[PDB]
Amino acid sequence: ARLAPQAVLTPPSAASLFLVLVAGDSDDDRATVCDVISGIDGPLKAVGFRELAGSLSCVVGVGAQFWDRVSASSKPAHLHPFVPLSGPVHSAPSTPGDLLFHIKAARKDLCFELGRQIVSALGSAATVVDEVHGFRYFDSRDLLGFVHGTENPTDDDAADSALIGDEDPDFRGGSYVIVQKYLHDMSAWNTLSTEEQERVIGRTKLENVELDDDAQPSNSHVTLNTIVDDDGVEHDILRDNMAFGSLGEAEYGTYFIGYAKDPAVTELMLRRMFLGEPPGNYDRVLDFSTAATGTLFFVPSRDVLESLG
Amino acid sequence: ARLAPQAVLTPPSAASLFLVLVAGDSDDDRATVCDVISGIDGPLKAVGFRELAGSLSCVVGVGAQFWDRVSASSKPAHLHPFVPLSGPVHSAPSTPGDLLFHIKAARKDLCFELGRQIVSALGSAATVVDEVHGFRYFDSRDLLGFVHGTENPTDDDAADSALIGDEDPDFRGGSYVIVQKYLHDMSAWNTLSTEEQERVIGRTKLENVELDDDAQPSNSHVTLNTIVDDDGVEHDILRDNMAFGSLGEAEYGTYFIGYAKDPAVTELMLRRMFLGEPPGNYDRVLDFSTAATGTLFFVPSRDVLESLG
Amino acid sequence: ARLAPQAVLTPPSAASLFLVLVAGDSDDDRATVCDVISGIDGPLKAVGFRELAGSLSCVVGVGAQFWDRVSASSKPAHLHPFVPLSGPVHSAPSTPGDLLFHIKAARKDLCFELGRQIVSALGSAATVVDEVHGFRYFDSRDLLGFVHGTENPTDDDAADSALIGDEDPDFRGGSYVIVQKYLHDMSAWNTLSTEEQERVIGRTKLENVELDDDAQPSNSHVTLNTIVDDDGVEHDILRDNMAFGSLGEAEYGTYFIGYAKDPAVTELMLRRMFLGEPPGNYDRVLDFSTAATGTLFFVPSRDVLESL
Amino acid sequence: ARLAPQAVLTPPSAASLFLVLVAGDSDDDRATVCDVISGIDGPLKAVGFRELAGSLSCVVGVGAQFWDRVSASSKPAHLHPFVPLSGPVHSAPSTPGDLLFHIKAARKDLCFELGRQIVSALGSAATVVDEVHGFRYFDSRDLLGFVHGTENPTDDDAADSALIGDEDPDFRGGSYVIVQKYLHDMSAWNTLSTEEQERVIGRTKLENVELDDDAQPSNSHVTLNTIVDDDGVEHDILRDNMAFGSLGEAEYGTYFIGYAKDPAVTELMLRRMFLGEPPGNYDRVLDFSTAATGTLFFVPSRDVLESLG
Amino acid sequence: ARLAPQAVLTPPSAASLFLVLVAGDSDDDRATVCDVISGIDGPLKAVGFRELAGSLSCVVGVGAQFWDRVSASSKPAHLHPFVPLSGPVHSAPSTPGDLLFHIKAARKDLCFELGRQIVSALGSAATVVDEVHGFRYFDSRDLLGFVHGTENPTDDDAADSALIGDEDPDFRGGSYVIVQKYLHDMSAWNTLSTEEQERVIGRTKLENVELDDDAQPSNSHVTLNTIVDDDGVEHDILRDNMAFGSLGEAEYGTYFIGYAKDPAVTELMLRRMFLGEPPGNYDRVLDFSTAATGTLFFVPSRDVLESL
Amino acid sequence: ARLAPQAVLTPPSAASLFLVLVAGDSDDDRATVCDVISGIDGPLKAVGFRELAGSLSCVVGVGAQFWDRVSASSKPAHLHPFVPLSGPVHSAPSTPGDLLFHIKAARKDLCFELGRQIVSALGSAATVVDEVHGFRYFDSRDLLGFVHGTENPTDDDAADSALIGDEDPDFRGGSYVIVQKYLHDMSAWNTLSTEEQERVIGRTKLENVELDDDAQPSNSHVTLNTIVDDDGVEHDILRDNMAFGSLGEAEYGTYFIGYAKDPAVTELMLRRMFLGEPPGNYDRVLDFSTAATGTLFFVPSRDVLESLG
Ligand code: HEM
Ligand code: HEM
Ligand code: HEM
Ligand code: HEM
Ligand SMILES: [Cl-]
Ligand SMILES: [Cl-]
Ligand SMILES: [Cl-]
Ligand SMILES: [Cl-]
Ligand SMILES: [Cl-]
Ligand SMILES: [Cl-]
Ligand SMILES: [Cl-]
Ligand SMILES: [Cl-]
Ligand SMILES: [Cl-]
Ligand SMILES: [Cl-]
Ligand SMILES: [Cl-]
Ligand SMILES: [Cl-]
C-alpha cells in the first residue's frame, strides 16, 4: 500500500519520526492545521516519491480535544484524552497532544524531510511538544536488548486488531493509537542477570523464545499484556516501538506506540501493567522504565481525514 | 502483481522499454500477432522468472484499427485512434501504432531480453515504429530536473482512475493508454531561472513542493492538468514517465505514458495543455517539449487478452 | 503475507529447508506434536521477526495416517498416503512422513534457526526422517542447468490452483503438497547434447523459451506435465523446487515440492511421468533423476492448523 | 581498510556520530581516558564485527591541552587549541574539547552502539559537551540543498592532503581535524533565489556544476576556500560534513569536520571565510550559518594512539 | 580507487557509456577540448559524488593525430592510429576518433549525466562520432550467450598487463585502449548447435568452463587470443566488454574495449583473429560478428592528463 | 583481492565451503592434483566472474605428506602434519588430508559451483574426507550464541600475523592453516546461565564486550588464546570460523579455521586450550565442543601454487 496516508499496517522500518504537536487556540490556527492534515497526501508523495522503494509512510493522529474543534458533528465511539494512571510504585502521566505524525521509512533523510515540510506548513498554527527519532537497533531489539515487536499481529489478524470495523461504521478503517515515550535506567537493568531480565520480559533474551507456561511469572510483561475475555477470545494491539537515545544526556529509550480498533484493550494492558493484576502485582519492566509522555489519538481513515474542514 | 501480463498498477521502476509496432496487412500477420500477444505470459515468465525479485512486467496495448481487424463484434466503449491537436505554435501529432509493449523492470537486461523475445516471436508480422529505452534519473526526476510522478494516485485511487469498471463490464479491468515521446530543448530551458521553471511546472524544483494557489500560475502544468468536473469530482490519470536520450544526436527526452479508465480525461488534459484554458493559455512546458509521437491503445485485461483469436 | 503460518503462495527464495518427520506412537507424542504444530506461528515469529525484510515463511503439512490420529472426526476430501508408482523403467517410492515443514527465507540462518527451534520443541515426540537444505542456483536454475519454475501460476491463478475452495468448504484455504527428493546422474546428463537435453525438458536451455509445438517430443517433461480437461481448461500446480547436494557423496539434487487444491492433478502428472502417455512413453527426465522419497501431506489453513 | 581505528580516509557514510568530550581534572580520570582510547580498537571491533559489511569506523581526536597531560615528552609540530575568529560581521568561537570521536557507519544503530560503549567505558572520567547525529540527506546534500563534499580529494591525493608525512616523521599517518557545528537560518536562505544561492556557494544547485571562472564571485564559498601558494600549488582538506537537525527546536545543521596534515590550511580557509579576502569580502555562507562550536584535535596514527599511557 | 580519472583497473559494472569524439580543426577547438579533458575530474566528481557507493568512473583516451596536435614535444612509445586489417573473409576497419570516454557506473543515470556534462562542456569544439550504452546481461554474458570477461587478469596481473611501467617511464601509469563496436548476426549464430558455438569460443556455454586441450579447435576464439612469448610467458589484455543494441534496427552488439601497456599485444590478437593463425585459419567468431568501428587511443595517467 | 587464488586476507562472508581431500597413491593421481590446484585460477574465475560483486574466493592448502610427494627439495620452514593433543578429558585428534579448499562467497550457489568444478576436475585422483557448508549465523554469531571473529586482526596487522615474510623468503606470502571441525553439545551448554557462558568465553554474550581483567577467569577462551612472548610481543592468528549443522543428526557445529605465518602460535594456543595454563587449567569451551578433525596445511602464495609440477 504505497504512499497513502493512514497506512496503519505498514511492516517495521529502519527509521521513524514521532512528532506530537499542540494547536494554537486561534481560529486561523485551527484551519491552517486542517489544510495541512487533510492534504497530508501532498507532502507524503512530495518526499516519498523521491525514493524508488516508496518506503515512506505517515499516519496522522488527532487528539480528542482538537477533534471537537473541527468535527463536533461526528465522533468516534471511543475517542478521549489519555487516561492517566497512578499505581502503587509507578505512574503513567497523561501529557498534552493535539496532532500525532507517526512517520516511517527505510532512511532518516526521508523521515526528517517529511517532518520538516509538515512543520513548515503548520508555521505558528502549531507547536512541537515531543520529537522522537526512532531507529532499528540490530535484529529488531530495544535498548534493553530484547527482540521487540515479535508477537505483533500480521495481515488479516492485524487489520482486525487495529482497524475500526462494522462496530462503528462511520469511522471504518480508522484506529486509536496510544504513544508513551519511555526512558530506561540502564545501570539498574544491567545489575540484573540475563535470566532475571528474561523473567521480567517473558521471553529468552538472545533467542527470543517465549518461556514455558510453567516458568512464566504471573507479572512478566508478556502475561500482563495478554488479554483474554470471558468467552476465551484474545485481543491484540499493533505496536511500532522504536529505540531512541542521547549519549550526553544519558537517555536510552523505547518509544511505545500501539494501535487498536478500541483503546479499551490498550488501556486494560496499561492498567494491568501499572496497577498490577492481581492488584499490586505490576510489570517489573516499569522498574527500569519511566514513561515521560502519554497521549491518545484517533487515526482517521484516509476518507475521514481528507474530509476535515 | 507477480509476472502477470497487463499489470497496469506497477510501481515505478529503474528501467523500462516502450515498443510501438505496426502490424502487417495479411491474415497470417494478424494471426501471428494474436498468438504472440494472447500468449504474452510465456515470454514474460521465461525472462522474468530468472530474476529472484520478479520485478519484470509487460503491459500490452492494442490500437483502434488493429482491434477492429481482430475483434469486430465487441469493442471497448472508448477505443478510437489518438486525436491530434493543433495549437497555434505547438501540436500533438497522431502517429501510427497497432501494438504497445510497455515493459518495466529493475534492470535493463530484463526489459531488453523480453523485448527481444517478443520481437523475435512477431518476426515479419510486425515492424517497430518507435522504441524507447527508459531510465530512472536520480531521485525520480525527469531531464528538466523536476521530480516526476509525484501526484500519481496510489492503491485504491489508482485502480479507480486507471481501470475500466461498471461503465463497460465487457472490458472490466482493461485501461486506455496514451503515449507521446517528448524531446526537450535544453538550451531554451536552461536560459530560464529556477523560479521561472517552477512557475512553468507548478512545484518547487529541488524540494518538489506544490506552489500555493496564490503563486501558482493559471497556465502551470499542474493547474492545466488538474481536472475537476461540474459536480466537483476530481479525475486522475496514472503516469509511468521515464527519461530517455542520446547524447550524440542531442536528444533529451520524456516519454509520456498515461493510463485512464476513460481517455476523455487524458484528452481533456491534453487539450487544456495544447489549446489553453482560457483558450490561448497553453502549458508552457510545451515551449520546451515537443511531441514526436501520439498513439492511443486499449489495454485489455488478462482474460480478454488471452481470448484474442 | 508477513510471518503467517501456511503461506502457500510465497514467491521463490534464496534459501529453503525441507523437513520431514515421523511422529511417535505414544498419546503424549501425538499431543506434543499437536501442541507444536498448532502454535507454529510462535517460533515463526520468534525467528522471523529478527529480519527486517520479514522473508521467513513456514508451511506445515500433515500426513494421512497422522491426521486420522488427531481428527478422525473430519477429513479433507483428498487426503490419503502417497501412491507408489511402478513404471516400465522407473518407480516413485512412497516413503514415511507424518509432518512436513516447508521453510523459506532470504537467508540460510533463518531457515536453520526455525528448524532448530521446531525440532527442539518436538523433542522425543518426533523424528527427522528427511532433511534437505535447498538453495537458489544462479538465475533460478536447477542442477540440470535449466531455468526451473518458469510456468508456475501466479497471483489469482496460483490461489485458484493451490488453495482449497468451495469444493470442500470445511478445509477452505488449505492445500495438498507432494514432495520427492530427486538425485541426478550428472555424468549421464552430460553425455547428452544441449539440444537433446532441451528435447527432454521441452524448453531451450540458456534462454528458457518453450519449444514450439512441432519441435516438442511427445514425451518431453513439459508435454507430459500439461493437464487439460475435456472442456479444454488447463490445470496447474504450484512448485517450489530447490537445488541441493553434497559434493563428497556426489549427490546433485532437485527437491520436488508441488502444491494443488486437488492432488489428483499432481498425481496424474506423476502417473503420466512414470508410466508415460501413451503408456511406456515415460518422461526421459526420469532417465537422469531418481526419487529417493515420496510423501503426500495435507496443508491445513491457519484456522484449522491453530485448532488441531 | 576494515575496522581499524584512525582511518581518516573512509568514503562518505549514511550515518555519523560526532562526540566531543572534556576530561576530568582528576588523575584516575586521565588514566581511564587513556585506557579507553589507546584500546579503542576493542569496542570498534566489538560493535563493527556484528555487521557483515564492516562499515563501522572511529577516528579518535585528542585536544591540544589534554595531549599535554598524557605526552609532554613528544608533540606534533602543529598541535594547539582552535584559533577563534572575530571578523567584521561574523564570529567563529573556540569552544572546549579534549576528546573527539568521529564515528561513521552504514547504519545508525552501529554508530549509537559504539558511542554508547565509549561513553560507558569512560564513566565519570569524561563528560560529553557536544553530540551530533549526522545523516545523509538525499544525493549527498546539505540542508541548504547543495551537494556537499564534491571536491574532496580522493585516494593518493587525499592521503597527501590529510595525513602527516616526511615533514613530521614522529607522527606519520596522523592528521589534524577541525570541527564546527553550524546552524542555519532556513527562512533567510529561502528568501534568496536559487541563482543568488548558487553565487553564494560557487556551484549550480541541482546539477552541482562549478560556475565558470567569469561568473564566479570573488566571495563565493568555493573561491574563498581555494588555497594556492606562491609556487602555484593547491592545498586541500578532506571534509566529512553531515546534516543534522531538530524539528521542534527548529535547528537545521551542517556539521563541519575537516582533516589536513597541517591545520594552517584549514585555518587560512577559516580566515578567508570570516575575515574575508580582500579583507571585509567574507563568505556569504556565513550570513545563513552560525558556528556554535569550534575545536581542533590531533588525530594520532594507530601506532601513536595505542602507545598513550 | 574512488572518483579518480583514468582508473583503468575498475571492476565490471552494471552500466557503461562509450563515447567517441572527433575534435574540430580550429586552435580554439583544440584548446576547449584540452581544457575539458584536463579538468575531467570536475564533472566526474560533480556527478559521481551524488552516489553514496561512488561507482562512477571515467577513463579518457586520446587518438594519435590529436595527441600530435597538443604535445608534438613528447609521445608515448606506442601511440599510432588503429591499423586496418583485411583478411581472407573479414576485415577490421580503422575509423575516426580523437577522444574516448569510457564511463562506468552502477546506474545508467550516472553514466548518462557524466556524458551530458562532458558533451555540453565540449560544445562546438567536438563531435560525437560513436556512442554506445552498454549494459550487463544476466550473469556477465554477451548477446552470443557466453560468460564474457572470465579470464581477465586481476589485481597485480591486471596492472602489469595494462599499465605502462619502466619500459616508457615518461608515461608511467598510462595505457593503450582499442575499441571496436561489433554487431552480431543472431540468426546465423542460432543455426549453430550449442556444441558448435562452444567450439567457436573455446569454453562451455552455460557453465563457462574452458574446453580441454584436445577438444579445443585451433581456430577457437580462446586459442587465437592466447599470446605466449618465446620464453613461455603469457601476455594478457584487460577487456571491459559490454552488451548493447536496438530491437527496432535488429542490432545486437558486443562493444569490444581492450587495454594493454603495449597495444602490440592487442594488435597481435587482432591479426591472429582476422588473418588467422596459421594464415587463413581465422576466428570463427568473425563469421557472426562484424566490427563497425576500430580506433586506438592512448590513456594518459592523471598527471599527464591534468597537464595536457 | 578480486578473483585471485590464495587470498588469505578476505573479509567475512555469508557462505563458505570447506573441502578436505586425500590424494590417490599413483603418479597419475599426483599429476592430476598438481594440474588442478596449480590451475585453480581457472575454475575460480569461471564461476566467480558470473557474479557482478566478485565475492568468490578460494584458498588452497597442501598437507605436509603430499607436499613431499611433489616438492621434495624445497619446503616451507614449518610444514609438518597436525600435532595431536591428548588432555585428560578432551583431545585434538590429527585426521587425514592432503588438500584443503577454503571457499568463500556471498551466496551458497557460488561456493557450491566452485566445489563442484574442483571435485569434477580431480575426478578419481582425490577423495573428499571432509565437507562442510558454512553459513553466517545472525550478527556474526556462532551456534553457541556469541559474536565470533571479533578480535581478528585487520589490514596491516592481519598481513603481519597470517603471511610468511622474511623468516622464510622462499615462501613469502604463503601461510599455514589449521582446521578443526567442532561439534557442540547444545543441551549441556544451555544448562549454563548466560553469565557462566560469558565466563567460559571471556566476553558478554549479546553486547560482545570483553570482560575486564578482574572478572576474566584465567581459563577463559579469550585468556588462554592470548599469546604474549617473553619480549612482551603479542602474537595473533587470523580466524575464518563459520557455523554449520544438520538438524536431523543433531549436529550443531563450529568450523575452526586459523591462519598463521608460523603454526607454532596456533599450536601453542591449542595446547593452552587442551592442556591448560597452568597445566590442567583447560578451556571450558571444550566441555561443550568436540573436535572431529585436525589437519594442518601449507597455503602457498599464488606464484608458488602455479609452479607445482
Ligand atoms: C514533456 C512532457 C511532460 C513533462 C516534463 C511533465 C512533467 C510533470 C511534472 C514535473 C509534474 C509534477 C510531478 C508529478 O505529479 O508528476 C507533472 C504532473 C502532472 N502531469 Fe505532466 N509532464 C509532461 C507531460 C504530461 C502530459 C502530456 C500530461 C497529460 C496528458 C501530463 C499530466 C500530468 C498530470 C495529470 C500531473 C499531476 C497534476 C496534479 O494533479 O498535480 N503530463 N508533470
Ligand atoms: C527431477 C525432477 C524434476 C526436474 C529436474 C524438473 C524440471 C522442470 C523444468 C526445467 C521445467 C520447465 C520450467 C518450468 O516451467 O518450471 C519444469 C516444468 C514443470 N514441471 Fe518439472 N521437474 C521435475 C519434477 C517434476 C515433477 C515430479 C512434477 C509433477 C509432479 C513436475 C511438474 C512440472 C510442471 C507442472 C511444469 C510446468 C509445465 C508447463 O505447464 O509448462 N516436475 N520442470
Ligand atoms: C564480437 C566480439 C567478441 C566476442 C563476442 C568475444 C567473446 C569472448 C568470450 C566468450 C571469451 C571467453 C570468456 C573470457 O575469458 O572473456 C573471450 C575471451 C577473450 N577474448 Fe574475446 N570476444 C570478442 C572480441 C575480442 C577481440 C576483438 C579481442 C582482441 C582484440 C578479444 C580478446 C580476448 C582475449 C584476450 C580473451 C581471453 C582468452 C584467454 O586467455 O582465455 N576478444 N572473448
Ligand atoms: C568450538 C570452537 C571455538 C569457538 C566456539 C570459539 C569461539 C570464540 C569466541 C566467541 C571468541 C570471541 C570473539 C572473537 O574475538 O572471535 C573467540 C576468540 C578467539 N579464539 Fe576461539 N573459538 C573456538 C576455537 C578456537 C580455537 C581452536 C582457537 C585456537 C587454536 C581459537 C582461538 C581464538 C583466538 C586467538 C581468539 C581471539 C582472542 C583474543 O585475542 O581476544 N578459537 N573464540
Ligand atoms: Cl527524523
Ligand atoms: Cl511494546
Ligand atoms: Cl531495453
Ligand atoms: Cl506526466
Ligand atoms: Cl537450513
Ligand atoms: Cl518441477
Ligand atoms: Cl548515533
Ligand atoms: Cl565543507
Ligand atoms: Cl548512458
Ligand atoms: Cl573480449
Ligand atoms: Cl556449498
Ligand atoms: Cl575462533
Short mmCIF file of N, CA and C and ligand atoms in Angstrom, two decimals, chain D residues 108 111-112 133, ligand 11:
data_model
loop_
_atom_site.label_atom_id
_atom_site.label_comp_id
_atom_site.label_asym_id
_atom_site.label_seq_id
_atom_site.Cartn_x
_atom_site.Cartn_y
_atom_site.Cartn_z
N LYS D 108 22.61 3.68 11.69
CA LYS D 108 22.52 4.44 12.95
C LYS D 108 22.91 3.57 14.14
N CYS D 111 26.49 3.14 14.89
CA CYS D 111 27.03 4.39 15.41
C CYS D 111 26.69 4.58 16.89
N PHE D 112 25.40 4.49 17.20
CA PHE D 112 24.92 4.69 18.53
C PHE D 112 25.54 3.69 19.51
N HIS D 133 24.24 13.79 15.67
CA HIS D 133 23.85 12.61 14.92
C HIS D 133 23.72 12.97 13.45
CL CL G 11 24.11 7.79 16.74
#
